[PDB]
Design a protein around this ligand. Structure first.
Ligand SMILES: Nc1ncnc2c1ncn2[C@@H]1O[C@H](COP(=O)(O)OP(=O)(O)O)[C@@H](O)[C@H]1O
Length: 416
């Protein structure tokens, strides 16, 4: 099961800047003999003038934690292959786009750089960065090799850069002969953790990678390294330098955890209204299990005079992005959401979490990951868990068992 694409898109639509990470980058140089090399500025990388111009113009002062290690590896001569894993928002897309723009020679009117995205909508996000960093390349044009593109059989395309989805790209490189694969200098496999979702996407990617010149630079980027992601990368990127950055560790040290005992949904709703009655609820998210519950809760709250924003799956991703952004600006004080709609999403400016229903997995057990990632976000936070059965009480006790910190009982009416 992979809702992966949607989540990856939403995270991009709302991302405004680099996520802060304090762990150190792990580099496994292809040759264990050769030393490690890092940079601390773009100038140190002797970039093509107009490319450097584009980099500053889009607001980048210096390379990010991950770029410090990737850029030099990618700009090495002769071109080395790279597998880079790091959580989203750490500068992976800016990196390989910089890589592509370095190798691309606008003089030559054929595809020189090829990037595979898992979906057209994600392709457009990469496409956005390219148009922006390479805005001082006059003759640089972009092509989308996607199922939607209605290109009629004919001559080869003249765009120096192609982005697209495995299925369409393979055809363009073979059957429909829109691209000469042997002329590709740089091949990027983006969002590997998302592309493994379809068995089809894997096989197609591999079969494309095999048509490339053997000295083509292969770059594969990924947020996570599940065993499946790893064994796939090994099949796509031969002789790889490997960059790994450990995901930031969420911390419940600065957070107050409560739970309220209830007997029905109607009581959970009253506990919550009481909570509004006591403290001013703002910058808060309320998590429900089903879309049915979320829309009901939001309707009931509105009726009680509380304005809330709903975040459920019937909304297009762009709509969820607009809501989330209003929530960040403080235009919205409270966000009601289903679990799935918020899973993995890096919503910012959240001081208060209300688990209207407790987070569980497909089976029925405590979803410790999701809990920690919600609550964790030395800044003070509030977390309130609504328990409404002996069963959901068990879940809470098992959550309080996993972590070794107590969830203090909170009496509905007594909230001093
Ligand atoms: N060197 C840099 N300096 C400042 N900001 C950057 C730099 N590289 C990327 N960013 C910004 O950080 C955010 C994450 O970049 P991105 O490459 O999209 O992350 P990823 O591809 O790893 O998900 C984006 O908003 C991007 O504009």
């Amino acid at each position: 099961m992979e809702d992966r694409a949607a989540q990856s898109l939403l995270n991009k639509l709302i991302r405004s800047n680099l996520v802060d990470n304090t762990n150190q980058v792990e580099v496994l140089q292809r040759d264990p003999n050769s030393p490690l090399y890092s940079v601390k500025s773009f100038e140190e990388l002797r970039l093509k003038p107009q490319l450097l111009q584009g980099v500053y113009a889009m607001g980048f002062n210096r390379p990010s934690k991950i770029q410090e290690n990737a850029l030099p590896l990618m700009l090495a001569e002769p071109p080395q292959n790279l597998i880079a894993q790091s959580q989203s928002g750490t500068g992976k897309t800016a990196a390989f786009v910089l890589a592509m723009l370095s190798q691309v020679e606008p003089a030559n009117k054929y595809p020189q750089c090829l990037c595979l995205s898992p979906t057209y909508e994600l392709a457009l996000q990469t496409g956005k960065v390219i148009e922006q960093m390479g805005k001082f390349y006059p003759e640089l044009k972009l092509a989308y090799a996607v199922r939607g593109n209605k290109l009629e059989r004919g001559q080869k395309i003249s765009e120096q850069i192609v982005i697209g989805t495995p299925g369409t790209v393979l055809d363009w490189c073979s059957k429909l002969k829109f691209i000469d694969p042997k002329k590709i200098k740089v091949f990027v496999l983006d969002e590997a953790d998302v592309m493994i979702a379809t068995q089809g996407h894997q096989d197609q990617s591999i079969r494309i990678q095999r048509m490339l010149p053997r000295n083509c630079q292969m770059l594969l980027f990924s947020a996570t390294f599940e065993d499946s992601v790893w064994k796939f990368a090994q099949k796509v990127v031969p002789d790889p330098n490997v960059i790994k950055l450990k995901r930031e560790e969420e911390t419940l040290d600065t957070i107050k955890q409560y739970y309220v005992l209830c007997s029905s949904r109607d009581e959970k709703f009253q506990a919550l209204c009481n909570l509004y009655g006591a403290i001013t609820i703002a910058q808060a998210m309320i998590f429900c299990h089903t879309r049915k519950t979320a829309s009901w809760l939001a309707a009931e709250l509105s009726k009680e005079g509380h304005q809330v924003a709903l975040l459920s799956g019937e909304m297009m991703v762009e709509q969820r992005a607009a809501v989330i952004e209003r929530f960040r600006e403080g235009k919205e004080k409270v966000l009601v959401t289903t679990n799935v709609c918020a899973r993995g999403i890096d919503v910012e400016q959240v001081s208060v979490v209300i688990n209207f229903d407790l987070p569980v997995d497909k089976d029925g057990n405590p979803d410790n990951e999701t809990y920690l990632h919600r609550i964790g976000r030395g800044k003070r936070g509030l977390a309130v868990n609504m328990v409404d059965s002996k069963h959901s009480m068990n879940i809470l006790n098992r959550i309080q068992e996993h972590f070794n910190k107590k969830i203090e009982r909170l009496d509905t009416d007594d909230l001093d």
